[PDB]
């Protein structure tokens, strides 16, 4: 049922944190 | 860029986030190609919201609150994931704080202020009040906000920033003026000139309060005041807050 919304949030959250690490790495160099 | 419609992020805002990334990062589309759809990405633990024993002194509790805020990470994606309307009644802002602990995404300074209030409503002997700093560097103006705090007559701050010296202060400053001057000096060390300080009233500890946060109860123009008038204005704000009781 609603487990598709959860997997959507999970997949998005993982990509958000992967992106945040890259952007954090960039914005100090 | 602000996500103006809840979570999961909608397809339109999601693409806009990646489009925005491709502008900023020198290898912006190489970054997306490597991340989007990747099946090997780290699992991110959902940070546990800290809970406190009554025997634990409040300053130690504040360390845990600030630790939790940091664990969410400063948001460098270019997209704000939560919409904060600053004039929203406190009860609506506290619903948002709770949502932020359940979704566990990166945040910036204003979100951290709201979170700091939400996580210290259990501490009625702790005074909480926003402090906003307007600084100037290289022909541009910059705004930063923290949650000022007062415990047992000592002033500190919680919050989120790019800089370590522009967020957490354990509640150790004897006066509000000493706290604010500590921020001004930290700004000066990274070549920012402090222009204005805006200090809010203390915030109610009731998470169902309909009252608004008053962000700008004192607005201080730093260089127009001069040092003695600046201190006296801060002492007055300190007294005003002492006389607004709310929990």
Mention every residue, 6+ apart, whose C-beta is less than 8 A from residue B175. Answer: B155, B234, B235, B238
Q: How far is CA B110 from CA B24, B50, B75, B115, B141, in A?
A: 23, 20, 11, 9, 17
Do B94 and B112 meet the contact criterion of CB atoms below 8 Å apart? no
How far is the C-alpha of B53 from the C-alpha of B14, rounded, in Å?
A: 41
Do B131 and B198 meet the contact criterion of CB atoms below 8 Å apart? yes
- Enclosing domain of residue B89: 1-247
**Cβ–Cβ of A20/B76 closer than 8 Å?**
yes
Rounded to 10 degrees, the C-alpha dihedral B85/B83/B132/B198 comes to -10
Cβ contacts below 8 Å, chain A against chain B, sum to: 61
Q: Which experimental method was this entry solved with?
A: X-ray
How far is the C-alpha of B242 from the C-alpha of B6, rounded, in Å?
A: 37
Name the minimum distance, in Å, from the CA of B21 to any CA of chain A.
Answer: 9
Resolution for the entry shown, Å:
2.0
Domains contained in chain B, number: 1
Question: In angstroms, how far apart are the furthest CA atoms of chain A?
Answer: 45
Query: In the block, which residue shows the tokens 């979100």?
Result: B111
**Cβ–Cβ of A13/B104 closer than 8 Å?**
yes
Q: State the catalytic residues of B.
A: 109, 144, 161
Do B13 and B79 meet the contact criterion of CB atoms below 8 Å apart? yes
Neighbours of B144 (CB within 10 A): 22
């Amino acid at each position: 049922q609603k487990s598709a919304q959860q997997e959507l949030k999970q997949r998005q959250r993982a990509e958000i944190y992967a992106l945040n690490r890259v952007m954090t790495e960039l914005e100090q160099q | 860029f602000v996500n103006r419609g809840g979570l999961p992020v909608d397809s339109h805002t999601w693409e806009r986030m990646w489009m925005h990334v491709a502008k900023i990062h020198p290898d912006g589309e190489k970054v997306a190609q490597r991340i989007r759809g990747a099946t090997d990405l780290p699992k991110i633990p959902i940070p546990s919201v800290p809970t406190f024993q009554p025997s634990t002194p409040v300053p130690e509790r504040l360390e845990a609150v600030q630790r939790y805020i940091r664990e969410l990470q400063y948001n460098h994606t270019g997209t704000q994931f939560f919409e904060i309307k600053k004039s929203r009644p406190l009860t609506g802002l506290m619903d948002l704080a709770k949502e932020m602990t359940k979704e566990a995404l990166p945040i910036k300074c204003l979100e951290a202020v709201i979170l700091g209030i939400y996580l210290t409503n259990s501490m009625p002997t702790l005074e909480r009040f926003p402090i906003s700093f307007k600084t100037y560097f290289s022909g541009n103006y910059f705004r930063h906000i923290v949650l000022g705090v007062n415990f047992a007559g000592r002033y500190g701050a919680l919050g989120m920033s790019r800089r370590e010296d522009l967020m957490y202060k354990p509640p150790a400053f004897r006066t509000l003026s000493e706290l604010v001057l500590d921020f001004e000096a930290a700004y000066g060390r990274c070549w920012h000139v402090l222009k204005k300080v805006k200090l809010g009233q203390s915030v109610s500890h009731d998470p169902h309060s309909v009252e608004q946060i008053e962000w700008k109860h004192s607005v201080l123009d730093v260089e127009r005041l001069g040092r003695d008038d600046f201190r006296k204005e801060l002492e007055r704000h300190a007294r005003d807050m002492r006389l607004k009781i709310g929990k």
